[PDB]
Design a binder for this molecule. Structure first.
Ligand SMILES: *[C@@H](CCC(=O)O)[C@@H](C)NC(C)=O
Ligand SMILES: *[C@@H](CCC(=O)O)[C@@H](C)NC(C)=O
Ligand SMILES: *[C@@H](CCC(=O)O)[C@@H](C)NC(C)=O
Ligand SMILES: *[C@@H](CCC(=O)O)[C@@H](C)NC(C)=O
Ligand SMILES: *[C@@H](CCC(=O)O)[C@@H](C)NC(C)=O
Ligand SMILES: [Mg+2]
Ligand SMILES: [Mg+2]
Ligand SMILES: [Mg+2]
Ligand SMILES: [Mg+2]
Ligand SMILES: [Mg+2]
Ligand SMILES: [Mg+2]
Ligand SMILES: [Mg+2]
Ligand SMILES: [Mg+2]
Ligand SMILES: [Mg+2]
Ligand SMILES: [Mg+2]
Ligand SMILES: [Mg+2]
Ligand SMILES: [Mg+2]
Ligand SMILES: [Mg+2]
Ligand SMILES: [Mg+2]
Ligand SMILES: [Mg+2]
Ligand SMILES: [Mg+2]
Ligand SMILES: [Mg+2]
Ligand SMILES: [Mg+2]
Ligand SMILES: [Mg+2]
Ligand SMILES: [Mg+2]
Lengths: 328, 328, 328, 328, 328
């Protein structure tokens, strides 16, 4: 609009707190926060994760206890990640759909205790396979697409049966959203939301999640690269999201987060649909490490989360959800 | 994105409060609120306005007292509207730039008492002319454009001298923003913001403001129609805003509000600049009347304000600012 | 284009390395890298920076020696940051334009020794003021815009006189690019490029830079907030860039980097001009801390830089430039 | 953005090599190169092609030997073109799907010897028909669309059975991509890519390919014009590409190349999908002829390939792939 | 528009000549052709150019004779290129503005003999400098921008004085179009058109032009690269064109041609202004070489020219203009 100095001085609105508040484009609130939680089997168990300072793996009893504080803070949902015992792992990932699996038990307990709390279950095979890869392997070690979808569908159904309001398919198999949707619709789970991990990249930022859960130790290399997206590609993410919306997803997600803010922006602008983003384990760890060392002020936590809002995210999966909910 | 029932059911996200909160596109906060206030001369004066139930005209001492509660609620700014004594009115609108006028006195007092509170003064001649029209009249009763700008410029300078952080030129004279900007820059008032009333319509919704201030009793007819915009025109508002941004405005405003939400949307989308909207006296009165009669629930207040945010407004001038700041 | 599973399987292109390479949208090369360097006064001085593991402050002799390896690796440019002795600081920031200042001496030495190496000098007052703020302060501690520009202009001229091919104004004063351009043109420095820090945010990610240089210890708060951009604002960055291009900038920059990738994307798309991004000290430190702790694989370095390319950056200022130039 | 001389001088970035490198918009790499190769029957056979100086037709043993150097150079894929013996030609193009045809034998040999090398087979009937036209002819000499698709489908299946990672249907029959996709999916060849020749023009630039392979001697005239695109049409190419993506293509191609760079640009911009371009035999020959004559410097080779990248191509089929891979 | 096989078969319109003609998007006509001609000093001189088979350098008498046939064919304009005698070359390029220079003499003769024929003179210093570079050199061999513009302005004025309807500034100096326009307007040459070479690349395709004229023997390397555009850059061409239109150009040109068709497309789409393209000497030579060798049919000539029309060119500078005008 032909704005020119000195008629236009962009510092005027910045002069005072009141005018900064008046022109501020985005605001972060507790409504934007989803807390991922690592869930152990057994009872009375709490375990620190060395590569995620401050994060604990919790047995279900402990989870129920901690959840009361998260509900009180107004965090709208949890994303559950079971820490499967090694003895429950198999080549067919059968534990994924065990009605008495950790995820199913934890969902039933939380739905009963806190009916208004959102439970987002993880539809994925990596915590259940002996090899820790994100699906069923053929003879050459390749993750079979359609065979893996059969297991994911059973898993999603078992989560719906346990009372999950949202199932979140996080393994990058083609066409899984449509298959899971068809199965939920056919079984009468009309209102179970699907939060698709639509543009999930072959990233090294998932490093600490291995320590937390005990899944694949290989990250961002040749095996993952046959289903997770190449970090170099942006246009391809639009094709991923378009397919997931056509297949019935209620929400779509970009993962990792901060290293992919341009993707969040393009996805929100292109589809105008509910868009989510995951601030992953490695993003949490690198921030925490710098804070603990006195290299960065604790204020980077809210700045990092404000960035997701500005980029177009409706909600953010973040291990900082509790700390953020206090600072807000 | 080829979304189709039953794969897509838009009710799933609506099923539960937590998912509604996760997908909610806009949130209203106290940062979005500007409270207009009617200011009397003298001391220890409070007067109810019959056509604006609940709104009082206040002398400066009373204003200072009430402002403490508004600051406490976190309202970022006030928009001052002096109620000029009839004996101070003139054909040349000289009281507009009186260093001891109500607006100037009130600004000095508030800037000293509450340094962080935003003061938005009204750059307009209607409260100062004997005839109550929005400028200086020629022999035929026509509001002269450039002669009126000379007075507005002096008025804006007097507001800057009194300490106003923002001057808000509300009479629709062409080119006034550039003239006021040049004068402020030349006088060294480098950081005084200009909140232009850019797309201000020839509306009947200003009815109760006459009762509040004692300005022109004619609204939305032949005289006003020679400077205020025709309610039928939308494209013309884009040309108004473009000119005001080129001339140096820091913020641009649409007025009235709810009857012009499509204009707020087009202005925000077209220019991506700080966009404000005025929920005028008549919008306040019609809501209040219906609430008092038991015809509408008090919840329409937050719904009306949420509409401005959804349409693209960064801030809202609203007589409901105090009530809203409590309900939020 | 109505792409649907199973006719469309986005995994097919991901199946093999050769097809991933064929469809890869972006490639990072040494041509994209700019190395920031901290320069000490004196001779035979090297100092480790505790909050930036692996980064050293170097006297000019040491810089000349290290630069031979950077040139050999094919890094196209350095961005110089002098570490001003406390005794050279003043209220008028006079050392900024000292023909014998560290930046000027280092520029002359490098231009002579490596004629093809790009030297990007820092046009900024924070390393030269006693208080460490980004300009000249008035009585209230406010950074004066136009008075600061007078000093920046002299500084930019002194850099051009020392042989700098690029001057990079990094303090967010309004209109500085036009003022610096007019002065360079009037003095006959027709080909000195201006790399504007156009959208530079009021960020906490600059933490370790304080330790490196000894500038302002306050970051992302009330003083910085009167000139650096609010992290919440995206549209405002487009207005910043538009002004800098109109004023004559040859290149425009977003800072910080990864937490602002959506801004890089919008700026590149909106203006189609040479766009740069700064992976700042705090981004370097948090990555390095996690790598050193064994929490993240060293591969996150190339992933972080690939993200800037994918988002639309033409070049990247990064303390990882040497390590990246080897891994590429 | 109101850029004006002399504030803006576009020569500043051009002044020095380092700044040219910093602002360079596109870079060509070996990852962008696909080498077409002409394959003979028999053993120990190498034949020069007079109209393609430097290009040889090779028997499979020779191809295996030469391929080691191409793999070493990092060329990601070959596009195979069999030179069918006259005695193997027929009206029903049966040799197209012979499990012991040249293309099938060459694919099996290369997949075994170099597992990481991409093999792109040619799905086309012109090398197999007695008449050399691109399909099966009816009584009037018209190329029948759906009858030709039946043969192409068998051919594509035979290539998948031989181990081809990519099948590239190059005869312009309507709907062939969908038919080939359905057949591959139904047969369990889930990951065989389809590189569609989507916008293939009725061009005279294919002249030397006749000499290389021995297919149709008529080019760009009345018969070809009933399936290949009219050189005058641009919008029509968007409809061709849209259909091929809907039908399941993993990659889409424009052919010829340089005379159709505007088409490459429109296709990439319109669909944001993996886009390929063929620098055909005639483009190779005209460049080579001029180089050999001393009329053009050898640098036109990299300039020609850089043009495809700038226009939006992800990969380039080019007889210059080996020479380019050395100069890069 | 959801077009799908077999409801949509794109071959139907291709079935018959009549329907191809009905849907053909672009048509080439003699109105699109501009013939470049090389002009010698003296009388009764014709010289063949070995690297441009079929092209002759002509003295003015011969040019006048040949022009009668070009006018008869309906070619709308000639672009004149003088072949300056070595004894007329100088460091100050003074022959460029000699009222008795070849270009000026040829213009006067042609304007008198064929008043309706368009004469496009070349505003450039390379045929007049001893060194053959495209401007006046400083001590370091750098082409000075503003000093070169002073000479170009005199040259353009001398062409207007000689009767040229169009002056075509072909040396890439910044701001030259505005300078030439101001001078023409101030001298009263109100209707002299400026055909700006706006996006002229640092290309190797100009090879044969050296043989024709005797200008710089260096092409597409380090000296040319400081003013001609980098072949890798597309967005930059939009900035070049925008500046030339703002400065007063009546027509804008892309050069070279076929290797830059994507640029022609972007320029036409972005500005909707009269857009021209130069099919340069090297494009002519490579086509001619292949035709003479029997490698390409003569039909590639019309296909090459049809490509420029399809890409968005209004007119084409082409050495094939006479041959094309016959085949059309
Ligand atoms: C994503 C990783 C989350 C994190 O790193 O914090 C989840 C769904 N699991 C895997 C195996 O990628
Ligand atoms: C606008 C009217 C506000 C209202 O009606 O509440 C102001 C600036 N004044 C006039 C006279 O229109
Ligand atoms: C930017 C900070 C760079 C960093 O943190 O690495 C520079 C130009 N200086 C300041 C004071 O912000
Ligand atoms: C295209 C021609 C390639 C070339 O000319 O180099 C191929 C697929 N075949 C035909 C017959 O057009
Ligand atoms: C352009 C070259 C034309 C050609 O190669 O045919 C002209 C204007 N001159 C130069 C020196 O580039
Ligand atoms: Mg997984
Ligand atoms: Mg997917
Ligand atoms: Mg949002
Ligand atoms: Mg939200
Ligand atoms: Mg008024
Ligand atoms: Mg106006
Ligand atoms: Mg808003
Ligand atoms: Mg707001
Ligand atoms: Mg600074
Ligand atoms: Mg700025
Ligand atoms: Mg780029
Ligand atoms: Mg680059
Ligand atoms: Mg064919
Ligand atoms: Mg087709
Ligand atoms: Mg590309
Ligand atoms: Mg590529
Ligand atoms: Mg020239
Ligand atoms: Mg130019
Ligand atoms: Mg046209
Ligand atoms: Mg034309």
């Amino acid at each position: 609009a032909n704005r020119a100095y000195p008629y236009t001085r962009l510092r005027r609105n910045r002069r005072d707190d009141f005018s900064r508040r008046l022109v501020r484009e985005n605001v972060l609130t507790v409504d934007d926060l989803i807390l991922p939680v690592f869930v152990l089997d057994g009872v009375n168990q709490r375990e620190s994760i060395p590569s995620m300072p401050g994060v604990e793996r919790l047995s279900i009893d402990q989870l129920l206890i901690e959840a009361e504080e998260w509900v009180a803070l107004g965090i709208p949902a949890l994303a559950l990640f079971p820490v499967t015992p090694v003895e429950k792992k198999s080549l067919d990932a059968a534990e994924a759909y065990n009605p008495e699996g950790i995820a199913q038990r934890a969902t039933r307990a939380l739905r009963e205790r806190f009916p208004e709390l959102g439970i987002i279950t993880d539809v994925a095979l990596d915590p259940f396979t002996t090899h820790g890869q994100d699906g069923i392997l053929d003879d050459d070690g390749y993750v079979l697409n359609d065979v893996s979808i059969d297991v994911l569908v059973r898993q999603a159904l078992s989560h719906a049966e346990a009372g999950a309001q949202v199932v979140a398919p996080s393994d990058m198999m083609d066409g899984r959203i449509g298959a899971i949707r068809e199965a939920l619709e056919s079984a009468g789970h009309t209102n179970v939301r699907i939060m698709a991990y639509s543009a999930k990249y072959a990233s090294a930022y998932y490093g600490p999640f291995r320590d937390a859960v005990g899944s694949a130790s290989n990250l961002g290399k040749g095996n993952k690269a046959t289903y997770q997206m190449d970090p170099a590609n942006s246009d391809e993410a639009l094709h991923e999201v378009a397919a997931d919306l056509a297949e019935g997803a209620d929400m779509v997600m970009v993962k990792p987060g901060m290293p992919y803010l341009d993707i969040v922006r393009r996805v929100k602008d292109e589809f105008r649909a509910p868009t989510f983003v995951y601030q992953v384990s490695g993003e949490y760890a690198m921030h925490m490490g710098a804070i603990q060392n006195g290299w960065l002020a604790e204020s980077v936590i809210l700045e990092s989360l404000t960035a997701f809002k500005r980029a177009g995210a409706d909600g953010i999966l973040t291990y900082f959800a509790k700390q953020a909910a206090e600072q807000l």
